[PDB]
Amino acid sequence: EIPVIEPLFTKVTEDIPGAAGPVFDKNGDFYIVAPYVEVNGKPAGEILRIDLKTGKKTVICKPEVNGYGGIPAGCQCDRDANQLFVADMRLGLLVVQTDGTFEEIAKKDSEGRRMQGCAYCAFDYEGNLWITAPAGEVAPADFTISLQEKFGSIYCFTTDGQMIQVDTAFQFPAGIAVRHMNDGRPYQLIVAEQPTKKLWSYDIKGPAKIENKKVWGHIPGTHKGGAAGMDFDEDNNLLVANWGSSHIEVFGPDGGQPKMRIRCPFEKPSALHFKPQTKTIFVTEHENNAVWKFEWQRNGKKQYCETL
Template identity: 40%
Template sequence: MAVTIELKFKKICDGLDGSEGPVFNTKGDFYAVAPMPTLEDGRVEEASQFLDKIAGNLHKVNLDTGEHEVVCTPQFEGYGGRPAGCQSDKNGNIWIADMRLGILKYSPEDGKCQQLSKVDSSGNALNGCNDLVFDKDGNLWVTGPGSPIAPSAEDRTLIFQKPSGRLYFLENGNTIPVAMDETFRFCNGIAIRDNLLLVAETMTRSIIVFDVVSSGKLSNRRVWATLPKADYDNPMNVGGPDGMDFDVNGNLLVAHHGGGHLEVFSANGVLKTRIKCPFKQPSNLHFKPASRTCYVTEHDFNGVWEFEWECEGMPMYHFTSQ
């Protein structure tokens, strides 16, 4: 039976509307995204984020002072972005999964943002993209829970009530991803360990796992773990696994959005520890390289928090030697 623990969380900053996508790049800089605009009354209006020309932001965060600055506000062809997930490549560029614009790449060196991918290899518009991870060969795996990206209007019924989520594979060096022959009920966070690819399916509270049998080829889909039930305090009663990250011992730490915990699963998918959070809606997490310090984003205070875990995080692709 899982043990619930309380660790010391320290708030680094707040004010990142819809705080998501925590990541370190190879320069040692920390970034997070604010996908949702704030209305004059201070509320985050979920529907308004999808209006034309409303753009979320990529922030660079000073972890010592809590200060953060907008370094990128993606907008293409008159449509604003909703950046959701981030990863770094070996050159320190930030790759962004965007719910309105597809797959983006931001270069800290010149401050420019590119819209790399809008369609898949079959010519179909990408689903709005939520999270992404590099494998050991520098290939990119991307979750797409949303309805098709701009200029299509968002279809919330399609996103939340139907198995319309897609999984994409972008081969190293290419810009056109391949859509896997798989569907999900809101595929969300994504992680990889050795030859296992894990995908969070939020609406079923499940972690789905695949065997990666060769480059861009998956087999043996199965449920690897299921999150505990929780009282999801929102009109749609929606919650479940969001972003996730491995530690060096092979444990998977999962942000339980709406559940108020980080759920820790053993290497074989057994829930072993529940980390109680000082907020209800953790959205993602990311380890500082070669460190036990873990950074968590959340939607109650729209902040970034840190805590110390029992071991270091598993090194990401961009911090491993090849």
């Protein structure tokens, strides 16, 4: 039997359609994304800042390219400048300034293929951004998602500006995380494949160089859904939102089966992110389309933006 804890979750804010992409920037401000905001039934997703002292929401960015609305879905903060890297299911990769300006980084990848819409991303400590792309081609192409068919891809957006496709044929690739050596070198990539209830691992040999794809962990449950967002704590345990299961799974450093589960007071956790230098985990969820927080046993693994 896998042990289960039921910590107290505190609701932070709600009314966030498709709440996802929790992230802290270099100044400790907190942001989330609302991928399912629509205008006239078309995509009009938003990036929002939340004042954690009051829960008040402020729309930061409503991205659109040549009239095609974005579906922002996952975020990382940069290290050398206070800007958000945002995976967008319609626009691919965005770099979003706090003043609301933004740039769409890649309409094509390094090999001249149309870019795919993206969902989650993770910076390694060298500044390369690893990205899951469960959508089909980016706008202006018609919107498609790899829920049933295996056309989701993985990318590495390198420090040279190359948008390198590093693998393909995933069925809705979701959360992504990078494991680092004590000396700081990245060496393992973990990638969720949501409906298959699998976590995959790769050896990282260098920037945009992964090999030795293997099943690394197993996500419990037969509910619709599976692994969504994930992040490491400071002991390199991987905490994984299990959308549809009412739990966050905890894997030890060597993977396999969860060593512990965390019961949530909602069915559809979608993403999680630690507040820097605390044990506090912020969790987005799609039952109530809301953001919550709870206290974990130890601090989070430092994000790239927290390194020097």
